[PDB]
Amino acid sequence: NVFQTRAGCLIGAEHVNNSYECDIPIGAGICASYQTSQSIIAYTMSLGAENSVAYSNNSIAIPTNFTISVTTEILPVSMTKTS
Amino acid sequence: ASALGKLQDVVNQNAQALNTLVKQLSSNFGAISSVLNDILSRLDKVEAEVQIDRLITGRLQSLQTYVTQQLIRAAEIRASANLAATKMSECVLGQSKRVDFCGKGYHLMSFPQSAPHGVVFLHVTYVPAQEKNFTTAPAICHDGKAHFPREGVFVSNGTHWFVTQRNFYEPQIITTDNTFVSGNCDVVIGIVNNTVYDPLQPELDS
Amino acid sequence: VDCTMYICGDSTECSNLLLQYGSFCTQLNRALTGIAVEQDKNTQEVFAQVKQIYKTPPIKDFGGFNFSQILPDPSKPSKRSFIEDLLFNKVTDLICAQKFNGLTVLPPLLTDEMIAQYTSALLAGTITSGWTFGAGAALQIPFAMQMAYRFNGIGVTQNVLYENQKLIANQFNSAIGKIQDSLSSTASALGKLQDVVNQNAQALNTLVKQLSSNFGAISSVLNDILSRLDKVEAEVQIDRLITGRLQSLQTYVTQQLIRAAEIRASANLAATKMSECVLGQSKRVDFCG
Numbered sequence: 026n027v028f029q030t031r032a033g034c035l036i037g038a039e040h041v042n043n044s045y046e047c048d049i050p051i052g053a054g055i056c057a058s059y060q061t062s063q064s065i066i067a068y069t070m071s072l073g074a075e076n077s078v079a080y081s082n083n084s085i086a087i088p089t090n091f092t093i094s095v096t097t098e099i100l101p102v103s104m105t106k107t108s
Numbered sequence: 109a110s111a112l113g114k115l116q117d118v119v120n121q122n123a124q125a126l127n128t129l130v131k132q133l134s135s136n137f138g139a140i141s142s143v144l145n146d147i148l149s150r151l152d153k154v155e156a157e158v159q160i161d162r163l164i165t166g167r168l169q170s171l172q173t174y175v176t177q178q179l180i181r182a183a184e185i186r187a188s189a190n191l192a193a194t195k196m197s198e199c200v201l202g203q204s205k206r207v208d209f210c211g212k213g214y215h216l217m218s219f220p221q222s223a224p225h226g227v228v229f230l231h232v233t234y235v236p237a238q239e240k241n242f243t244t245a246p247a248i249c250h251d252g253k254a255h256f257p258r259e260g261v262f263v264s265n266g267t268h269w270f271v272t273q274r275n276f277y278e279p280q281i282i283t284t285d286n287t288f289v290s291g292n293c294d295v296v297i298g299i300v301n302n303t304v305y306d307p308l309q310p311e312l313d314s
Numbered sequence: 315v316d317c318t319m320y321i322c323g324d325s326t327e328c329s330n331l332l333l334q335y336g337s338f339c340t341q342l343n344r345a346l347t348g349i350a351v352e353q354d355k356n357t358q359e360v361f362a363q364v365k366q367i368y369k370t371p372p373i374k375d376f377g378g379f380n381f382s383q384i385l386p387d388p389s390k391p392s393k394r395s396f397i398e399d400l401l402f403n404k405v406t407d408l409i410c411a412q413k414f415n416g417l418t419v420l421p422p423l424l425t426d427e428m429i430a431q432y433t434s435a436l437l438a439g440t441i442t443s444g445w446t447f448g449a450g451a452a453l454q455i456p457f458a459m460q461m462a463y464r465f466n467g468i469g470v471t472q473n474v475l476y477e478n479q480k481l482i483a484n485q486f487n488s489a490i491g492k493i494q495d496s497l498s499s500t501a502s503a504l505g506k507l508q509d510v511v512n513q514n515a516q517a518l519n520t521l522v523k524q525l526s527s528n529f530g531a532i533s534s535v536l537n538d539i540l541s542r543l544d545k546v547e548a549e550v551q552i553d554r555l556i557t558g559r560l561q562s563l564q565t566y567v568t569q570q571l572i573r574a575a576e577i578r579a580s581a582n583l584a585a586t587k588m589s590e591c592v593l594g595q596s597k598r599v600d601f602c603g
């Protein structure tokens with residue numbers, strides 16, 4: 026199976042309209058993922074999940090609840106000292 | 109096992125170039141062999157001099173490649189180290205007001221944890237959850253004076269205008285100790301009617 | 315860059331010699347890929363910090379703040395705010411020439427139309443939701459009641475805005491207008507970008523022109539040395555080409571590494587501003603200007 030792209034000539038993955046969050050980046054916003062049996066697909070990378078905030082000049086939204094999340098953040102500090 | 113990739117990538121790239129740097133010893137570089145002694149064993153020196161050049165020139169260059177990589181790569185780590193030392197100072201030791209510098213959400217505290225040739229922070233952050241649609245007003249006319257929230261904002265579940273803090277919902281009856289007066293009504297856009305209760309007035313009547 | 319081709323064009327004779335320098339050819343690709351990868355990491359860190367794509371409400375009432383300048387233009391085929399078009403015209407053959415010898419320009423993972431959706435989202439949430447969308451679910455708040463906070467941030471009590479709103483509206487709008495001409499009437503504002511693009515296209519030209527240099531060899535055409543010299547001597551000649559060219563890559567590669575490390579630093583500066591300045595409100599004096 027052959028599918029022409031913006032990035033290049035992509036062989037072996039059936040096209041899909043239906044755009045999902047990116048999985049394996051390729052180029053020009055074409056992200057391939059494995060699932061449907063299953064076959065490698067390729068599709069236009071969808072950016073996030075759409076939202077439209079209901080907005081009006083008198084409308085405010087105050088959170089009444091909270092959560093406390095602990096998020097690991099990882100950094101290099103030193104590298105192996107070689108001479 | 110992919111969370112530590114940042115560290116894992118650093119360690120690999122170091123061990124990577126070393127392998128490459130070693131494998132460069134086995135390359136001919138145009139010389140007759142990669143064993144420095146074989147050129148000396150087979151050939152009389154007069155000529156073997158020119159051969160060993162191609163080894164040296166090749167290898168000696170191949171170091172500068174490796175060295176330059178390390179310099180460049182260290183300069184990245186040197187930048188990442190400051191980012192840590194910045195977080196360690198601001199995030200761990202203090203409390204950071206920099207949005208999403210300590211990680212998504214309002215930041216409470218951070219816990220450093222060591223990791224090989226690296227560091228790992230546990231950022232304890234405050235993320236709000238459940239919302240309600242409120243009708244709001246920027247100000248409240250009382251007598252024709254305007255009352256603005258001292259801290260937080262006015263909101264109204266139904267008729268009762270509630271002043272409350274911004275990032276958590278704790279409705280409070282509106283009293284002059286919640287609001288400072290400014291100007292008067294005809295200016296502020298969207299000001300609404302209400303009665304701002306007085307702490308003092310009830311205390312009086314006796 | 316294709317190391318084997320760029321060095322040895324269409325010649326196994328040269329191609330075999332290259333094997334005697336070992337992993338140079340491969341480690342260059344390993345080098346440039348490291349750059350090429352993180353470029354789409356930079357653009358990833360900067361633009362997409364937001365979980366969802368917000369979009370402006372259908373009707374614009376901000377209290378007098380015209381954002382039609384900066385908001386996506388619904389009538390363009392690629393939706394990009396009126397301003398952004400001023401930019402894409404200023405910034406700018408090299409199209410296939412480089413691509414002759416194995417110098418390839420890979421497409422950036424994110425198309426410009428996507429970049430304009432992020433900068434729509436970030437700008438859509440900033441307007442409607444205040445700064446809270448960076449800390450979690452966006453919270454609709456009246457824009458005029460947003461600016462009451464952002465004054466409290468700088469120490470000006472909010473009663474200034476609720477009274478001066480109309481005035482502040484005009485000062486804002488009339489300020490946005492001049493941003494057009496600031497860009498429209500002068501092409502040097504974008505020099506920072508323009509310098510980056512040039513220096514890249516610069517070294518590529520230089521890298522190409524190095525193909526035409528003798529480097530001590532009898533000619534710069536790899537085949538002429540083969541068609542005008544029995545191989546046994548031509549071996550030594552092609553060395554001076556290879557040694558010259560192969561070096562000339564490491565020069566180019568090292569430049570890119572160094573230059574990318576600058577961009578990598580500039581990218582974080584953006585991602586820092588984007589997070590702190592756009593998504594929040596900055597207390598850092600003259601960090602946001």
Ligand SMILES: *[C@@H]1O[C@H](CO)[C@@H](O)[C@H](O)[C@H]1NC(C)=O
Pocket residue numbers: 041042043044
């Ligand atoms: C993708 O989405 C379109 C609707 O936008 C729909 O017509 C199509 O069936 C979808 N693709 C799939 C899942 O086949």
Ligand SMILES: *[C@@H]1O[C@H](CO)[C@@H](O)[C@H](O)[C@H]1NC(C)=O
Pocket residue numbers: 079086239240241
């Ligand atoms: C407010 O109501 C609208 C519907 O009018 C809804 O789309 C929105 O999600 C609601 N928001 C909150 C904060 O409940």
Ligand SMILES: *[C@@H]1O[C@H](CO)[C@@H](O)[C@H](O)[C@H]1NC(C)=O
Pocket residue numbers: 374379380381382383
């Ligand atoms: C924003 O300004 C433009 C200037 O061309 C104007 O045409 C547009 O109607 C304005 N209003 C909005 C939609 O904000």
Ligand SMILES: *[C@H]1O[C@H](CO)[C@@H](O)[C@H](O)[C@H]1NC(C)=O
Pocket residue numbers: 089090091
């Ligand atoms: C609010 O309620 C939710 C659901 O029960 C709970 O997860 C959260 O921890 C509570 N926080 C508060 C405000 O007590």
